[PDB]
Each structure stands twice: as structure tokens, then as C-alpha cells.
Design an enzyme around this catalytic site. Structure first.
Site, PDB file in Angstrom:
ATOM      1  N   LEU A   6       1.030  -1.161   0.205  1.00 20.79           N
ATOM      2  CA  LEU A   6      -0.099   0.199   0.023  1.00 20.79           C
ATOM      3  C   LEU A   6       0.930   1.359  -0.006  1.00 20.79           C
ATOM      4  CD1 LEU A   6      -2.814  -1.405   2.566  1.00 20.79           C
ATOM      5  CD2 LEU A   6      -2.466  -1.642   0.199  1.00 20.79           C
ATOM      6  N   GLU A   7       1.457   1.367  -1.313  1.00 17.94           N
ATOM      7  CA  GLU A   7       2.357   2.825  -1.273  1.00 17.94           C
ATOM      8  C   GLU A   7       1.481   3.993  -1.299  1.00 17.94           C
ATOM      9  OE1 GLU A   7       5.462   2.040  -1.291  1.00 17.94           O
ATOM     10  OE2 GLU A   7       6.338   3.874  -2.477  1.00 17.94           O
ATOM     11  N   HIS A   8       0.353   3.979  -1.447  1.00 17.80           N
ATOM     12  CA  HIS A   8      -0.868   5.058  -1.497  1.00 17.80           C
ATOM     13  C   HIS A   8      -1.635   4.811  -0.678  1.00 17.80           C
ATOM     14  CE1 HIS A   8       2.207   6.856  -4.142  1.00 17.80           C
ATOM     15  NE2 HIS A   8       1.796   6.083  -5.417  1.00 17.80           N
TER      16      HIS A   8
END
Ligand code: NAG
Ligand code: NAG
Lengths: 301, 274
Positions: free
Chosen positions: B127-129
Site C-alpha cells: 500500500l504505497e498510496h
């Protein structure tokens, strides 16, 4: 036959290995260290995490054991290693302030080099400071102090023991035309001109099973010598598969470079190697000489 | 203290030139393969899986083959793109339903089975963003109900793949606070100046492992030997592995990715250090 006696008779300074207390206490391993190798590098006991595990609290037991073994056996030591990003205690990389790091690094070097003053042949003062593309590795040392960390480190070591030869050491310096090799040469040449007390370049020579050809080793090592540095050494040699012809290529890279003082192979028995599955050393898992050992003996005999 | 586990998780799906999922499992280098990425999801009922042009028609049979060789296959959701979010409780349950009925044990006529009757072994959250209102906690809790260890059903390995720096962003913390993540892979090969293998990873490792004692932690390394943050295998043997393994909850090594590892054979030695 003795690798060290043969290489010295051939006009070099030493043929060496790595070791440390547990290995020196193993009677099979110790007999080979005694008979074959004139120089020993501590495998782990002189790294910063062992020597200064919290700030200003030094621990000497393992390093003292190896130095005392060498003294007693009329062997010399490559101290390894003063400034390096790996096996560094987390308290050092948590330093947020340049001036604090300068004090910490100066103190570390001064205490370690000073303790062993007059007992150390070479120090690997800085280790693995280059990226593969020739830029500086963004360690805590480079990020806070910049390129000047190198000069500070060498100056500190020189003052603490003027008799030790001070080395910069790295891997993948195995091809003259490779970016990393060229960077090492370029920077050492510049630092020499600036008065930085660098006595040697150390080429680790960890040959993988998909590496540059060992036919390139001679030219690579000469390119390091051609900086004007006073000496070079092959410092951590091991070769996947341990083919005799590859080991002879490295032997001859040293023999044919006037400034190469010696070769260290990175251990005694294959079974004790970081890369044991690749059988990369000169003795097998029962401490018996392998083909590459016999080839080196034939070449020097 | 911890110790070696022999576990190596590799990411797959990012480069169609990396060979099939079957080839990766048949290498014998990995104990888990994580497909990547389910790159679109959110509140409007739209989902997308991005496997970079890999031949989708072979994937189902390849998953079953991997499993037949004792190698589980998981699916990572998220990625580096901007096409995903989970802004409500309902959206998280809708994503669960999509994953369950598309890729795991569920069968609904209205949910396509892209890989037929193949039934995956886990879900990874990459979940980079995200934002603090995301409800990956709701998703995690629903997935955890299906993690069967003995009995009808099969294991479901719920994991997160996180940035080096601790603490994580709130959307990640919210998910991990459920307490039921089996593994977390801590990426240490990125260009975060104060948190990577060249500087700072260990202090972060200490914080991550302390914060989640019931979770197994994997050190994430790149198999790209040209990366600024690559670790020479010798420095995994001497440094990374022994340090990481001092923690009771050390789980293994994660490798980014199959494409790089296929080129460099990093895992041929790393599997002995993990
Ligand atoms: C990778 O290892 C495999 C055997 O596992 C071998 O077939 C291949 O040539 C190796 N690649 C390299 C770069 O040596
Ligand atoms: C999600 O919403 C459902 C229905 O309101 C609720 O019962 C459940 O507790 C919620 N999940 C969480 C973890 O808040």
C-alpha cells in the site's frame, strides 16, 4: 609445501588467510593456518559492531585473541575494518549531526588503531565506499561528511600508527574498464595528490560463478597500481568452483604487478566459507588440499 | 533469539520476460511466490489485475503446479500506481468479495474466475498510496476468517509489504493494528536516504519487529545487482541475515523480484542464509 614460504621465495610479502578465535581453536584448521599462511585477517572481530557496540564502550576480546595468536606464531595481521556501512552498530547510523559523526569516527579509529599500534601490517581503513557505477555509497559517513570522511579516516589512522600501511578496500575491482574500478583509481590518484595518506588499494576478488573472466584480473590490478599508490593487494580472494586456471590467473595478476605485496584467500576450508556451496577455497571440507592448491604449489615450485 | 528459517518469498508479475510462475516454482529457490499487482480497486465496483503482459491463460495451471511442488502462491494488491483506495467499510467488504470469489474458494456466477478453479494461498498488501480513512483493517479481518490451520479449508497467509521507515503511514498502521497479519516484508532496497541497506535499515527493523511481536518479519532485498541498495551476498551472510535473525519474530528474506533474480541468481546463495 607452504603457500606463504613459496610466495615469499617468489619475491612477495605474504600469502594470507582470514580467521578468528573459534577457527584458531579448531586443531585441524589451526595446523593449516600455522603451516601455510603468513598473514591473517580477522574475519569479524575487528569490525565496528564487535569493537564498539555502544559509544565509547570498546570490546577487545576476540580481536586481542587473533592479534596474540599472530604475535605468538610470527604472523602479521591485516586489521579489518575501521569505517564501513555494514556490520556497523545502529547507534552510529542514528547520528544526525556531521560534527558528532566526525568525533565518533575519529575516536573509533584512534582507539582501535592506537590499541594495536606497532602490531598491524595493513589496516583496511575504509571499506566498500563505492557503488557499482562509481559514485559514493550513501552510507552515514558519506551522507553526513561527504567525500571528506575518507581523508579524515586516513589522517586519523596515520597519526595513531604511522607504521601500518593504510588501505582502501573494495570488491568488484576485477575489470580495468568497469566504472567502479575506474572510480577507485581516479579518486585514489586525486587523494594522493592532495596529500591523503593512502598506502594501498585492496581488491577483494570475490569471483562469483557469473563474474568477469579471471583473464581480466591482471589488467585490473595494474590499473589500481597505476594510480601511483605505493602498494596493492588482493585481500579476500575466493572463486566459485575453485578452478585451478582461475586461481593461477589471480596468482599471476599479483606476480606480474610489481606493487602487489601479497594475496589473501578468504578462509581455509570450503566448509567455513560464506559461500561454502560454491566450494571456493583451496582446502576441502576435510581440510585437504584441492587441485587449485596443488596448481599454485606447482606454479611457485 | 530467532534463527534461519529457510524462507524466501519472491515477487512475480512485474515483467513478462521473467518467465512463467511455473518456472519460478520449479527453480526450487522459493518458499512463496507473490503475484503482483491487483492495481485497481475502490468504491465503484471496478477491479483490475496487472501482470505486465504475462500469458494469463497459463496462470491457473501454473498456480496449481506450484502448489503441487509445495510452493504457495499469494496475490499482492496495491502497487506503486494511483489506481487504488479503500475509503469505506463497504468498499473493503466488496474487495474481499471480489478476491474471495475471483481467486480463492468462492464461486458466484456473477464473478469471473480469471484463473479458473485455482485457489490462492494468501493476500499481500503493498500500500504505497493511501489515506487514514482507508479500511484495510476490515479487509484483513475478513481474510483472517479463512486462514485455516487444520480442518476444512486451507491456510491463507495474510501479509503486508511495507517501506523501510517506521512508523508506517496511518492506512498501514490501521491494518496492522488488527494483530492478525502473519508476515510483514520490510523493503530495505529503496532510495529512502535514511532508511535502506546503506543507511538506517537496522534501526527500523528493531522498531518494526518490536511493534508486532505476533508477526513474522522478512527482510526485503533487491536481486538487482546494479541497484544502489543491493547487498553483496557475502554481506547478507555476515551482516543482514545474522542481524535480522537476532529477533524472535524473524521470518525470512523477501526478494524483489523474480525478473532480477532470474538474471542474477541472487537466491542461489540467499536461500542458504535465510
Ligand atoms: C542461474 O542458475 C541456473 C541454475 O540454477 C543456471 O542454469 C544459469 O545459467 C544461472 N545463471 C547465471 C547468471 O549463471
Ligand atoms: C464494518 O461494518 C460492519 C457493518 O456496520 C460492522 O459490523 C463491522 O464491525 C465493521 N468493521 C469494522 C472493523 O469496523
Amino acid at each position: 609445501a607452504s603457500l606463504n614460504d613459496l610466495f615469499v621465495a617468489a619475491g612477495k610479502s605474504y600469502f594470507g588467510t582470514c580467521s578468528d578465535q573459534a577457527l584458531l581453536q579448531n586443531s585441524q584448521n589451526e595446523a593449516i593456518v600455522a603451516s601455510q599462511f603468513g598473514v591473517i585477517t580477522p574475519e569479524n572481530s575487528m569490525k565496528w559492531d564487535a569493537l564498539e557496540p555502544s559509544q565509547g564502550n570498546f570490546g577487545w576480546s576476540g580481536a586481542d585473541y587473533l592479534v596474540d595468536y599472530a604475535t605468538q606464531h610470527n604472523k602479521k595481521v591485516r586489521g579489518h575494518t575501521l569505517v564501513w556501512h555494514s556490520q556497523l552498530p545502529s547507534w552510529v547510523s542514528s547520528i544526525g549531526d556531521a560534527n558528532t559523526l566526525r568525533s565518533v569516527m575519529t575516536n573509533h579509529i584512534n582507539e582501535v588503531v592506537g590499541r594495536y599500534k606497532g602490531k598491524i601490517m595493513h589496516w583496511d581503513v575504509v571499506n566498500e565506499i563505492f557503488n557499482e557505477d562509481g559514485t559514493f555509497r550513501n552510507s552515514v559517513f558519506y551522507n553526513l561528511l561527504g567525500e571528506d570522511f575518507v581523508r579524515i579516516a586516513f589522517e586519523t589512522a596515520r597519526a595513531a600508527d604511522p607504521d601500518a600501511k593504510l588501505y582502501i578496500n573494495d570488491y568488484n575491482l576485477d575489470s580495468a574498464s568497469y566504472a567502479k574500478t575506474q572510480a577507485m583509481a581516479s579518486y585514489v590518484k586525486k587523494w594522493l595528490a592532495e596529500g591523503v595518506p593512502i598506502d594501498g588499494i585492496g581488491s577483494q576478488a570475490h569471483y562469483s560463478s557469473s563474474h568477469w573472466s579471471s583473464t581480466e584480473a591482471a589488467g585490473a590490478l595494474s590499473s589500481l597500481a597505476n594510480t601511483g599508490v605505493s602498494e596493492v593487494a588482493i585481500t579476500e580472494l575466493d572463486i566459485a568452483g575453485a578452478a585451478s586456471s582461475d586461481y593461477l590467473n589471480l596468482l599471476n595478476a599479483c606476480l606480474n604487478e610489481q606493487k602487489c605485496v601479497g594475496i589473501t584467500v578468504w578462509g581455509v576450508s570450503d566448509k567455513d566459507s560464506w559461500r561454502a556451496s560454491d566450494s571456493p577455497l583451496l582446502f576441502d571440507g576435510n581440510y585437504q588440499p584441492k587441485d587449485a592448491y596443488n596448481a599454485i604449489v606447482n606454479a611457485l615450485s | 533469539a530467532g534463527g534461519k528459517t529457510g524462507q524466501v518469498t519472491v515477487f512475480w508479475g512485474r515483467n513478462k520476460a521473467e518467465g512463467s510462475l511455473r518456472e519460478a516454482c520449479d527453480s526450487g529457490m522459493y518458499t512463496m511466490v507473490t503475484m503482483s499487482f491487483l492495481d485497481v480497486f475502490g468504491a465503484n465496483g471496478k477491479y483490475h489485475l496487472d501482470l505486465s503482459g504475462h500469458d494469463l491463460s497459463s496462470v491457473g495451471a501454473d498456480i496449481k503446479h506450484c502448489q503441487s511442488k509445495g510452493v504457495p502462491v499469494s496475490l499482492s494488491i496495491g502497487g506503486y500506481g494511483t489506481g487504488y483506495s479503500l475509503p469505506s467499510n463497504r468498499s473493503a467488504l466488496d474487495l474481499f468479495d471480489h478476491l474471495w470469489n475471483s481467486y480463492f474458494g468462492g464461486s458466484k456466477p456473477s464473478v469471473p474466475r480469471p484463473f479458473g478453479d485455482a485457489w490462492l494461498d494468501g493476500v499481500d498488501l503493498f500500500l504505497e498510496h493511501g489515506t487514514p480513512a482507508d479500511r484495510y483493517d476490515v479487509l484483513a479481518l475478513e481474510l483472517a476468517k479463512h486462514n485455516i490451520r487444520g480442518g476444512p479449508g486451507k491456510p491463507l497467509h495474510l501479509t503486508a509489504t511495507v517501506r523501510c521507515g517506521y512508523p508506517p503511514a496511518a492506512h498501514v498502521g490501521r491494518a496492522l493494528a488488527t494483530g492478525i497479519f502473519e508476515r510483514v516484508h520490510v523493503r530495505t532496497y529503496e532510495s529512502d536516504k535514511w532508511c535502506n541497506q546503506n543507511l538506517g535499515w537496522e534501526g527500523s527493523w528493531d522498531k518494526w519487529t518490536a511493534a508486532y511481536p505476533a508477526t513474522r518479519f522478512y527482510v526485503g532485498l533487491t536481486a538487482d545487482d546494479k541497484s544502489h541498495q543491493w547487498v553483496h551476498p557475502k554481506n547478507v551472510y555476515y551482516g543482514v541475515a545474522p542481524v535480522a535473525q537476532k529477533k524472535d519474530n524473524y521470518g525470512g528474506i523477501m526478494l524483489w523480484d523474480r525478473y532480477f533474480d532470474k538474471q542474477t541468481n541472487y537466491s542461489s546463495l540467499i536461500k542458504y542464509y535465510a
